[PDB]
Protein backbone atom coordinates (compact mmCIF):
# COMPACT_ATOMS: atom_id res chain seq x y z
CA UNK A 1 0.00 0.00 0.00
CA UNK A 2 3.02 2.29 -0.21
CA UNK A 3 1.48 3.93 -3.33
CA UNK A 4 -1.15 5.31 -0.91
CA UNK A 5 1.46 7.17 1.15
CA UNK A 6 0.42 10.45 -0.47
CA UNK A 7 -2.90 10.25 1.43
CA UNK A 8 -1.00 10.17 4.73
CA UNK A 9 1.64 12.73 3.88
CA UNK A 10 -0.51 15.85 4.41
CA UNK A 11 1.30 18.47 6.53
CA UNK A 12 -0.79 19.44 9.59
CA UNK A 13 0.83 22.91 9.63
CA UNK A 14 -1.08 23.67 6.41
CA UNK A 15 -4.34 23.16 8.27
CA UNK A 16 -5.31 26.16 10.41
CA UNK A 17 -6.64 25.16 13.82
CA UNK A 18 -9.35 24.48 14.49
CA UNK A 19 -10.63 23.37 11.08
CA UNK A 20 -14.08 24.66 10.08
CA UNK A 21 -15.31 21.07 9.71
CA UNK A 22 -14.49 20.57 13.42
CA UNK A 23 -17.82 21.26 15.12
CA UNK A 24 -19.32 20.51 18.56
CA UNK A 25 -21.36 17.45 17.54
CA UNK A 26 -18.06 15.66 16.82
CA UNK A 27 -15.43 17.13 19.14
CA UNK A 28 -15.38 17.98 22.84
CA UNK A 29 -13.68 21.00 24.45
CA UNK A 30 -10.48 19.01 25.04
CA UNK A 31 -10.14 19.10 21.25
CA UNK A 32 -10.28 22.88 20.88
CA UNK A 33 -7.75 23.15 23.69
CA UNK A 34 -5.04 21.93 21.29
CA UNK A 35 -2.70 24.65 20.03
CA UNK A 36 -2.30 23.45 16.44
CA UNK A 37 -3.43 20.68 14.09
CA UNK A 38 -0.03 19.08 14.52
CA UNK A 39 -0.56 18.93 18.31
CA UNK A 40 -3.79 16.95 17.75
CA UNK A 41 -2.39 14.51 15.20
CA UNK A 42 0.56 13.75 17.47
CA UNK A 43 -1.81 12.85 20.33
CA UNK A 44 -3.79 10.77 17.86
CA UNK A 45 -0.68 8.84 16.80
CA UNK A 46 0.26 8.38 20.45
CA UNK A 47 -3.15 7.07 21.47
CA UNK A 48 -3.51 4.60 18.65
CA UNK A 49 0.08 3.43 19.03
CA UNK A 50 -1.13 1.82 22.24
CA UNK A 51 -1.65 -1.92 22.17
CA UNK A 52 -5.28 -2.63 21.48
CA UNK A 53 -6.25 -6.22 20.81
CA UNK A 54 -9.12 -6.78 18.36
CA UNK A 55 -11.50 -7.03 21.35
CA UNK A 56 -10.77 -3.63 22.88
CA UNK A 57 -12.91 -1.44 20.64
CA UNK A 58 -14.58 0.06 23.70
CA UNK A 59 -11.46 1.09 25.58
CA UNK A 60 -10.04 2.55 22.34
CA UNK A 61 -12.92 4.96 21.73
CA UNK A 62 -12.90 5.91 25.42
CA UNK A 63 -9.18 6.65 25.30
CA UNK A 64 -9.79 8.55 22.07
CA UNK A 65 -12.47 10.65 23.78
CA UNK A 66 -10.35 11.03 26.89
CA UNK A 67 -7.00 11.92 25.34
CA UNK A 68 -7.78 13.69 22.01
CA UNK A 69 -11.31 15.12 22.39
CA UNK A 70 -12.91 13.04 19.66
CA UNK A 71 -16.49 12.25 20.61
CA UNK A 72 -16.98 8.57 21.22
CA UNK A 73 -19.77 7.95 18.70
CA UNK A 74 -17.68 9.74 16.01
CA UNK A 75 -14.66 7.44 16.55
CA UNK A 76 -17.05 4.51 16.26
CA UNK A 77 -18.48 5.28 12.82
CA UNK A 78 -14.99 6.14 11.52
CA UNK A 79 -13.42 2.85 12.65
CA UNK A 80 -16.48 1.35 11.03
CA UNK A 81 -15.84 2.98 7.64
CA UNK A 82 -12.15 2.04 8.14
CA UNK A 83 -13.13 -1.64 8.44
CA UNK A 84 -11.55 -1.31 11.90
CA UNK A 85 -8.07 -0.66 10.49
CA UNK A 86 -6.45 1.66 13.03
CA UNK A 87 -3.55 2.50 10.74
CA UNK A 88 -5.89 4.42 8.44
CA UNK A 89 -7.21 6.43 11.40
CA UNK A 90 -4.85 9.41 11.03
CA UNK A 91 -5.53 9.32 7.24
CA UNK A 92 -9.23 9.94 7.92
CA UNK A 93 -8.61 13.07 9.94
CA UNK A 94 -5.86 14.56 7.75
CA UNK A 95 -8.08 14.22 4.67
CA UNK A 96 -11.21 15.33 6.54
CA UNK A 97 -9.45 18.47 7.70
CA UNK A 98 -7.40 19.06 4.57
CA UNK A 99 -10.34 19.04 2.16
CA UNK A 100 -12.98 20.03 4.78
CA UNK A 101 -15.23 17.01 4.22
CA UNK A 102 -16.63 14.31 6.54
CA UNK A 103 -16.02 11.63 5.45
CA UNK A 104 -13.38 12.02 2.74
CA UNK A 105 -15.08 10.81 -0.46
CA UNK A 106 -12.07 9.61 -2.46
CA UNK A 107 -9.54 7.92 -0.19
CA UNK A 108 -8.53 4.26 -0.26
CA UNK A 109 -9.45 2.49 2.96
CA UNK A 110 -12.25 4.96 3.71
CA UNK A 111 -15.53 3.20 2.85
CA UNK A 112 -18.38 5.61 2.11
CA UNK A 113 -22.09 4.79 2.06
CA UNK A 114 -22.12 4.60 -1.74
CA UNK A 115 -19.10 2.30 -1.60
CA UNK A 116 -21.10 0.06 0.70
CA UNK A 117 -24.20 0.37 -1.50
CA UNK A 118 -21.99 -0.70 -4.41
CA UNK A 119 -21.04 -3.98 -2.72
CA UNK A 120 -24.59 -5.13 -3.43
CA UNK A 121 -24.13 -4.81 -7.21
CA UNK A 122 -23.72 -7.71 -9.65
CA UNK A 123 -22.41 -5.16 -12.13
CA UNK A 124 -18.87 -6.30 -13.00
CA UNK A 125 -18.11 -2.60 -13.56
CA UNK A 126 -19.26 -1.74 -10.01
CA UNK A 127 -17.09 -4.40 -8.43
CA UNK A 128 -14.09 -3.39 -10.54
CA UNK A 129 -14.65 0.19 -9.39
CA UNK A 130 -14.39 -0.74 -5.72
CA UNK A 131 -11.31 -2.86 -6.28
CA UNK A 132 -9.62 0.04 -8.12
CA UNK A 133 -10.48 2.41 -5.24
CA UNK A 134 -9.67 0.39 -2.06
CA UNK A 135 -7.68 -2.63 -3.31
CA UNK A 136 -8.41 -6.33 -3.74
CA UNK A 137 -7.59 -7.04 -0.08
CA UNK A 138 -9.83 -4.36 1.40
CA UNK A 139 -12.59 -5.41 -0.99
CA UNK A 140 -12.67 -9.09 0.00
CA UNK A 141 -12.59 -8.16 3.68
CA UNK A 142 -15.46 -5.67 3.28
CA UNK A 143 -17.55 -8.43 1.70
CA UNK A 144 -17.20 -10.71 4.75
CA UNK A 145 -18.58 -7.93 6.95
CA UNK A 146 -21.35 -7.21 4.45
CA UNK A 147 -22.16 -10.94 4.45
CA UNK A 148 -22.93 -10.81 8.17
CA UNK B 1 -52.05 17.82 34.03
CA UNK B 2 -50.45 21.12 35.06
CA UNK B 3 -46.75 21.87 35.09
CA UNK B 4 -44.81 25.04 35.73
CA UNK B 5 -42.63 23.98 32.73
CA UNK B 6 -45.50 25.16 30.52
CA UNK B 7 -43.86 28.62 30.32
CA UNK B 8 -41.13 27.02 28.18
CA UNK B 9 -43.70 25.48 25.83
CA UNK B 10 -46.21 28.25 25.46
CA UNK B 11 -44.01 30.98 24.00
CA UNK B 12 -46.07 32.62 21.29
CA UNK B 13 -44.35 32.04 17.94
CA UNK B 14 -45.97 35.23 16.54
CA UNK B 15 -43.64 37.09 18.91
CA UNK B 16 -40.61 35.59 17.17
CA UNK B 17 -39.80 37.38 13.92
CA UNK B 18 -39.04 34.96 11.09
CA UNK B 19 -36.58 33.83 10.18
CA UNK B 20 -34.90 34.24 13.59
CA UNK B 21 -31.32 35.49 13.61
CA UNK B 22 -29.97 32.38 15.32
CA UNK B 23 -31.27 30.23 12.44
CA UNK B 24 -28.18 29.94 10.22
CA UNK B 25 -27.66 28.03 6.96
CA UNK B 26 -25.25 25.66 8.70
CA UNK B 27 -28.19 24.57 10.88
CA UNK B 28 -31.15 24.84 8.53
CA UNK B 29 -31.94 24.17 4.87
CA UNK B 30 -33.74 26.16 2.14
CA UNK B 31 -37.13 24.61 2.99
CA UNK B 32 -36.92 26.15 6.47
CA UNK B 33 -36.33 29.71 5.29
CA UNK B 34 -39.35 29.27 3.03
CA UNK B 35 -41.79 28.91 5.94
CA UNK B 36 -43.94 32.05 6.15
CA UNK B 37 -43.67 32.52 9.92
CA UNK B 38 -42.38 30.96 13.10
CA UNK B 39 -45.82 29.42 13.70
CA UNK B 40 -45.84 27.67 10.33
CA UNK B 41 -42.52 26.07 11.27
CA UNK B 42 -43.82 25.01 14.69
CA UNK B 43 -46.98 23.40 13.31
CA UNK B 44 -44.93 21.38 10.78
CA UNK B 45 -42.59 20.37 13.61
CA UNK B 46 -45.54 19.30 15.77
CA UNK B 47 -46.87 17.25 12.86
CA UNK B 48 -43.61 15.41 12.41
CA UNK B 49 -42.88 14.60 16.05
CA UNK B 50 -46.45 13.51 16.68
CA UNK B 51 -45.90 10.84 14.04
CA UNK B 52 -45.29 7.23 15.07
CA UNK B 53 -41.75 6.13 15.87
CA UNK B 54 -40.34 3.05 17.57
CA UNK B 55 -37.47 3.58 20.04
CA UNK B 56 -35.25 2.32 17.24
CA UNK B 57 -36.28 4.90 14.61
CA UNK B 58 -34.03 7.91 15.37
CA UNK B 59 -32.69 7.69 11.82
CA UNK B 60 -36.10 8.00 10.19
CA UNK B 61 -37.18 10.81 12.52
CA UNK B 62 -34.05 12.76 11.68
CA UNK B 63 -34.68 12.17 7.98
CA UNK B 64 -38.30 13.27 8.44
CA UNK B 65 -37.24 16.49 10.20
CA UNK B 66 -34.84 17.25 7.36
CA UNK B 67 -37.43 16.61 4.59
CA UNK B 68 -40.47 18.21 6.29
CA UNK B 69 -39.09 21.01 8.48
CA UNK B 70 -35.73 21.72 6.88
CA UNK B 71 -33.60 20.95 9.91
CA UNK B 72 -30.15 19.59 8.98
CA UNK B 73 -29.63 16.01 10.12
CA UNK B 74 -26.51 16.59 12.21
CA UNK B 75 -28.42 19.32 14.10
CA UNK B 76 -31.53 17.20 14.69
CA UNK B 77 -29.11 14.54 15.94
CA UNK B 78 -27.36 16.81 18.46
CA UNK B 79 -30.79 17.99 19.63
CA UNK B 80 -32.12 14.48 20.29
CA UNK B 81 -29.01 13.87 22.31
CA UNK B 82 -29.62 17.03 24.39
CA UNK B 83 -33.18 15.81 24.96
CA UNK B 84 -32.28 12.23 26.00
CA UNK B 85 -34.47 11.16 23.07
CA UNK B 86 -37.62 12.84 24.38
CA UNK B 87 -39.46 13.87 21.20
CA UNK B 88 -41.96 16.05 23.06
CA UNK B 89 -39.26 18.53 24.08
CA UNK B 90 -38.37 19.39 20.45
CA UNK B 91 -40.81 22.31 20.20
CA UNK B 92 -39.51 23.71 23.45
CA UNK B 93 -35.92 23.52 22.16
CA UNK B 94 -36.69 25.69 19.11
CA UNK B 95 -39.01 28.18 20.81
CA UNK B 96 -36.34 29.02 23.42
CA UNK B 97 -33.44 28.89 20.94
CA UNK B 98 -35.26 31.34 18.68
CA UNK B 99 -36.58 33.50 21.52
CA UNK B 100 -33.33 33.88 23.40
CA UNK B 101 -30.87 33.70 20.54
CA UNK B 102 -28.97 30.78 22.05
CA UNK B 103 -28.14 27.27 20.95
CA UNK B 104 -28.68 25.12 22.88
CA UNK B 105 -30.97 27.01 25.28
CA UNK B 106 -28.89 26.84 28.49
CA UNK B 107 -31.62 27.15 31.16
CA UNK B 108 -34.51 24.99 30.01
CA UNK B 109 -35.90 21.91 31.78
CA UNK B 110 -35.43 18.82 29.60
CA UNK B 111 -32.57 20.37 27.62
CA UNK B 112 -29.29 18.92 28.87
CA UNK B 113 -26.24 21.10 28.23
CA UNK B 114 -22.53 20.22 28.32
CA UNK B 115 -22.31 21.81 31.77
CA UNK B 116 -25.38 19.82 32.90
CA UNK B 117 -23.74 16.56 31.83
CA UNK B 118 -20.48 17.51 33.56
CA UNK B 119 -22.25 18.19 36.85
CA UNK B 120 -24.04 14.86 36.59
CA UNK B 121 -20.76 12.94 36.79
CA UNK B 122 -19.04 15.32 39.23
CA UNK B 123 -20.87 13.69 42.09
CA UNK B 124 -20.70 17.04 43.87
CA UNK B 125 -23.97 16.97 45.83
CA UNK B 126 -24.71 20.68 45.38
CA UNK B 127 -24.34 20.65 41.57
CA UNK B 128 -26.58 17.58 41.45
CA UNK B 129 -29.26 19.19 43.62
CA UNK B 130 -29.31 21.98 41.02
CA UNK B 131 -29.70 19.48 38.16
CA UNK B 132 -32.60 17.76 39.90
CA UNK B 133 -34.36 21.11 40.40
CA UNK B 134 -33.81 21.96 36.72
CA UNK B 135 -34.78 18.65 35.06
CA UNK B 136 -36.50 16.64 37.81
CA UNK B 137 -35.67 13.24 39.28
CA UNK B 138 -37.26 11.35 36.39
CA UNK B 139 -35.13 13.05 33.74
CA UNK B 140 -32.12 12.85 36.07
CA UNK B 141 -32.38 9.05 36.36
CA UNK B 142 -33.04 8.76 32.62
CA UNK B 143 -29.86 10.76 31.97
CA UNK B 144 -27.95 8.54 34.42
CA UNK B 145 -29.15 5.57 32.38
CA UNK B 146 -28.02 7.58 29.35
CA UNK B 147 -24.51 7.16 30.83
CA UNK B 148 -24.42 3.40 31.46
Amino acid sequence: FSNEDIYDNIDPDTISFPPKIATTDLFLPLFFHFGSTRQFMDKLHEVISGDYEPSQAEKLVQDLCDETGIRKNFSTSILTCLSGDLMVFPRYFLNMFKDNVNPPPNVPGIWTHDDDESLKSNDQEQIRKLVKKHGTGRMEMRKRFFEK
Amino acid sequence: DFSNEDIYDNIDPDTISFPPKIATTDLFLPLFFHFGSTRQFMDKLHEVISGDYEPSQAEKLVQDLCDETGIRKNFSTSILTCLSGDLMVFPRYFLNMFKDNVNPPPNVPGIWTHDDDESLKSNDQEQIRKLVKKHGTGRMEMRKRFFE
Binding site: Y52, A57, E58, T80 | T77
Partner: peptide
Protein backbone atom coordinates in the same frame (compact mmCIF):
# COMPACT_ATOMS: atom_id res chain seq x y z
CA UNK C 1 -3.51 -3.35 14.45
CA UNK C 2 -7.13 -4.02 13.60
CA UNK C 3 -10.22 -3.85 15.78
CA UNK C 4 -12.63 -6.80 15.61
CA UNK C 5 -15.47 -5.63 13.41
CA UNK C 6 -18.13 -7.38 15.49
CA UNK C 7 -17.21 -5.39 18.60
CA UNK C 8 -17.39 -2.20 16.51
CA UNK C 9 -20.56 -2.90 14.53
CA UNK C 10 -22.47 -3.34 17.79
CA UNK C 11 -20.71 -0.59 19.71
CA UNK C 12 -22.25 1.56 16.96
CA UNK C 13 -25.81 0.33 17.48
CA UNK C 14 -25.03 0.77 21.19
CA UNK C 15 -24.19 4.47 20.84
CA UNK C 16 -27.20 5.31 18.68
CA UNK C 17 -29.89 7.41 20.38
CA UNK C 18 -33.16 5.77 21.42
CA UNK C 19 -36.48 7.55 20.95
CA UNK C 20 -38.21 7.99 24.32
Amino acid sequence: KMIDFATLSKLKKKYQIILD
